[PDB]
Structure formats: C-alpha cells, structure tokens
Ligand binder design. Sequence first.
Ligand code: MG
Ligand code: MG
Ligand code: MG
Ligand code: MG
Ligand code: MG
Ligand code: MG
Ligand code: MG
Ligand code: MG
Ligand code: MG
Ligand code: MG
Ligand code: MG
Ligand code: MG
Ligand code: MG
Ligand code: MG
Ligand code: MG
Ligand code: MG
Ligand code: MG
Ligand code: MG
Ligand code: MG
Ligand code: MG
Lengths: 62, 106, 119, 62
Amino acid sequence: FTAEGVKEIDYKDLNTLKAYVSETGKIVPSRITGTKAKYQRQLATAIKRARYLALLPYTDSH
Amino acid sequence: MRHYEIVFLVHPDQSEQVGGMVERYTKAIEEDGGKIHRLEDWGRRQLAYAINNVHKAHYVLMNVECSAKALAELEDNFRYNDAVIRNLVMRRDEAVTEQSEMLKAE
Amino acid sequence: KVKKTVVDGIAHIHASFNNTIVTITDRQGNALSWATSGGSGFRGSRKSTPFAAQVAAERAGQAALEYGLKNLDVNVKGPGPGRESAVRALNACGYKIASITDVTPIPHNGCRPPKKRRV
Amino acid sequence: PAVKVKENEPFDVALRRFKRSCEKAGVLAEVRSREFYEKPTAERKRKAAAAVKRHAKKVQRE
RNA sequence: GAGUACGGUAGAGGGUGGUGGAAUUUCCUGUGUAGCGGUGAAAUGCGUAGAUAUAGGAAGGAACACCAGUGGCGAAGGCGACCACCUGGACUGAUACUGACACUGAGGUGCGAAAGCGUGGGGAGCAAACAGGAUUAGAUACCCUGGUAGUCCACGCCGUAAACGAUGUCGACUAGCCGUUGGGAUCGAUCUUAGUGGCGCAGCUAACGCGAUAAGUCGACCGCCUGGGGAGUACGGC
Ligand SMILES: [Mg+2]
Ligand SMILES: [Mg+2]
Ligand SMILES: [Mg+2]
Ligand SMILES: [Mg+2]
Ligand SMILES: [Mg+2]
Ligand SMILES: [Mg+2]
Ligand SMILES: [Mg+2]
Ligand SMILES: [Mg+2]
Ligand SMILES: [Mg+2]
Ligand SMILES: [Mg+2]
Ligand SMILES: [Mg+2]
Ligand SMILES: [Mg+2]
Ligand SMILES: [Mg+2]
Ligand SMILES: [Mg+2]
Ligand SMILES: [Mg+2]
Ligand SMILES: [Mg+2]
Ligand SMILES: [Mg+2]
Ligand SMILES: [Mg+2]
Ligand SMILES: [Mg+2]
Ligand SMILES: [Mg+2]
C-alpha cells in the first residue's frame, strides 16, 4: 500500500480485500503477506466491516 | 455540521421505488440545513449469505452533512421501515465526492 | 416394502473419537440407509478404528444400492478416525464421488467446553 | 475446505488433495483446541513459552 | 525543571445504547431403523412410547474463531465482534507564553482479580454442594452419567491474592550488538525520540545472576526488618 497511494484500506474495494482472505474466507496472517502492522490492522477492520454488509462471506460454508 | 457516510440496502421486491426513499430522505435532511455530497447507486448485487431468507438486495450509498436531529430521524426511518434489511453509518471527517467503485468491469 | 427410485445421493460421515456413523440421503436430507461401527459388531476399543468405519461404509453402501444412487456427494464431519477410510470404502461400493466437503462445526466463541480431565 | 473430481482422475489424488486442503484450513487443530476448557492463565503461559521458543529458533539460525 | 496555547498521530483506555455471524441447548415437523453415549475396560444414562443421524422452522442466553504479534492501552486491578454518542490520558513538530509555579509524602481520601453477601431480573453452556456407576483393602478422591447455588445484568457492600519484575517514587551520569511498536529529520541507508524484548564490556553480588527497562556510580523523601516455633494467633479498639 506504500507503493503509490491509498491513505487507508477501504471496505468498498473488494478487489484488494479479496487478496487478503483464504479460500476458506479467513484473514491472512501478516507474517505470510508481509504487510506492515498498521496496514494489517486497517485490513482487519475493513474486512470485518465489509463482511457485515454481505460483500464478503464470514465462512465458505454458510 | 458533521460528516457521515451511510450504506443502505433495500429488499429486492421493493427495489423499484428506491428513488422515492432516496429523495424523501435527502429532502428531510437538507431541509434542516443538511447537505448531500455523494449519492451512489450500485444496486442489485448478490449476497454472500442469506439475510431474512433472501439472496438479493439493492445497495445504495450516500454521504451527508447533518446534525444530531437529522441523524436520529433518519435512523428511525431505517429502523421502523420494513424494506431496510441492513444498515451502516460510518462518521468521518472529510467530504468524499468522487466515485467509490461504480462498475469497473464491462 | 413399496419401491422408490432416487439418483444422486449425499453420504454424511459423522466421525467422533469413539464411533463413526454413515448416513446416505437424497438432496432433501431424507435418509435412506445408515450404518455404524458399533452396529457392525466391534463394540469397544475396536470401535475407534478405520477398519470399523470401512466396514460400516461398506454395509451402508450395499444397502443404498437398492434405490439406485449412481452418484454420491460426500460430507465429512468430525476429528476421529474413520474420516478417510469411509470415503474410500464408499467409492469401492461402486458409486461416483462428485466431491468431498468438510462440514465440521466450529464455534467462533460459543459455549465454554467441559473442564480438563486430570489423568 | 472442499474439493471436486474433475477430468477423470483416479480416486487417489482427489482424496489426498482433500486431505491437504483440510490440513491447510486447520480443522483438526480447531477441534482439538475446543476439546476442553483452557483457563486464561494456561493460555497466556502457553503463548509466552511459544514466543520464547520461536525467538530462540530465530536466533539460533545465526 | 514544571506547566499553557496550536496542527497531527496510534490505541482490547472508560461509560451509555443499538446490531451481527458461527456454535451449543430446548421445542415443532418430514425421512428412517436398532442402536447411541461414555471408558484403560466398563457400567450408570438415553432408545423401538421410534433414539443417535439427517433436513426445515422457532425461542433464548453467554462468549466474541481467523486478524493475534517478546503486539497495544491503563496508576494498578485490568481491557479483544461491529456501529453511533459522551469522555480521560499518552506520543509527535514548529513557533509563542508563564517564570521554580518542583520532588516525596506519616495521618487522610479514592480505585482495587476471583470467590462471597443484600435486593430485584435472567437461565444456553459450564459447574462447588448433592445423587448414581466404576476403581480400590477402603475411596467422603482422581475417572464416567446427571446436577442446584454461582457464573450474566442493575444498584449496594466486601477490601483481600504467588494483588509478582517476589525489585517504592523522582532526577542525573556510565562500552557495545541484534529485533520490534507509535512518530519525526538527512541523503533504501543514517540520525534522533517515547516504549517493548534477546545478548553482553566495566562495575556489583554469598552465589545464582543484574548489567541505560541496573541489582553499577550518586542525590531527595517515604515504608519496612532484627533467630525458628507459639502466631499474623489471643485480648482490646475500629
Ligand atoms: Mg467429556
Ligand atoms: Mg435431530
Ligand atoms: Mg498511607
Ligand atoms: Mg464477581
Ligand atoms: Mg455471590
Ligand atoms: Mg454462602
Ligand atoms: Mg438471584
Ligand atoms: Mg453435565
Ligand atoms: Mg447474587
Ligand atoms: Mg497482603
Ligand atoms: Mg496478577
Ligand atoms: Mg509484597
Ligand atoms: Mg531501584
Ligand atoms: Mg533513572
Ligand atoms: Mg543479560
Ligand atoms: Mg543484594
Ligand atoms: Mg520471635
Ligand atoms: Mg486476626
Ligand atoms: Mg488471612
Ligand atoms: Mg479483633
């Protein structure tokens, strides 16, 4: 996210959010993706918030 | 006043008069000194899970500049309306006004 | 005693640390046949082995050939043994396994579980 | 965690692929964790010990 | 030194309401037939009055998977779903402002895990007491099947913990190396600031060990100790 822009990770960008979920539908640990801690926290909050609005699934099963 | 961002999705059966609800809400909140900055409609998407045993909903976004009174009355409208399903209000500090995701795909 | 045909069944394997239960149903969840490790005549330490699960799946499949069921989808659920031997018994019964899915229920916080055994 | 049998392969790669997918998801670990109740003292102690061992593992590489 | 005004950051800091998804339990209904559950092995227990399994629906309560980390915040106790509202402090940068306005602190005042107590609600799971089955020489235990106070909420009391870093608060100096959290400057690297960790020279220690987050070198104030039991007990007061 430090490459060009994006002052934060928004909950409306599903294309970026889907890069940080596993096929099950869980958040990917920061030690794998190499993301900074601050940006990982922003990922977590955005993913939960978008998961509320049914844009992302809580679980692959449902 | 104070900035707010509201995401609001309507039952698919009533997903034809959504213009009316948008207009009445906008009037009711800008008649008290409020303001509308962005009003986006990307409705009729598929749900990632079934809410009230439906799998479709009509999404809409609006950024508003309102006060406590307008907030409370709009929240009541969403609360006691039956074509509301789900709601999200996300106060922020800047007026965002230039597209969010629209339909990037063809 | 009356006849009814049905194609494309779903087989549920319910594996625990003590037993396994295999149940073949239609798409609507209507059970046609079932079998269990204890029903196969193992009854004890032998009940918690993949061999018992394989025999149970064999019996259930042979019962289910009555209705037809050229095709089975599979739902595995539970941590115990017999988790995979049941599926490889089911195919050898002759069905065409389209897919396998794990449906083990996981709480997100849930109720608190029992106290720990002091053994 | 789910798979499919696609393009006429034996029922010996699909089963192993399903096993690998389930291991990657973390099903047995989750069930073994909720098997009994772990009091917060024990949880915190385990996290501390694992962190110490992880740090020693990292340091011993050099 | 200590404070004020001004932008700006990160946070499970606190309080009041609203709402989510997974799972368990009970209840209603369809299919279906002889087992299910549990153990080291069993038995108690639940089933042909149709169980466990499986599919649909409804009610309710509590905890908040992944993110999650020698990570963060708080004086400590402690604080992990999401949103709005009310609110405390810390960090950071430039300029201006007051002009020693400071540190510690016997009495005193306030916050203070869990269990417990009072009044009124609630009741899914777990589970002191209790009942039954095992094991045993016995078994008022470990183990199994059940299960009530309690655990949850509001207000009030209680005032204790291996309440621990077993290390009082404040300030100043004393080789270095390797990580990490919030944030600035210079040209990914270097410098710098407040935290949080692993090693380590001097020095200190009975030794273990500490070692800029000192248990080293110093200063200001406070609390406490004086062989082991009897005993943190008796009597008196509060
Ligand atoms: Mg148990
Ligand atoms: Mg049932
Ligand atoms: Mg005092
Ligand atoms: Mg309590
Ligand atoms: Mg009590
Ligand atoms: Mg009592
Ligand atoms: Mg009561
Ligand atoms: Mg019980
Ligand atoms: Mg009480
Ligand atoms: Mg004490
Ligand atoms: Mg403590
Ligand atoms: Mg002490
Ligand atoms: Mg000291
Ligand atoms: Mg000092
Ligand atoms: Mg050291
Ligand atoms: Mg000493
Ligand atoms: Mg004495
Ligand atoms: Mg006394
Ligand atoms: Mg005492
Ligand atoms: Mg006395």
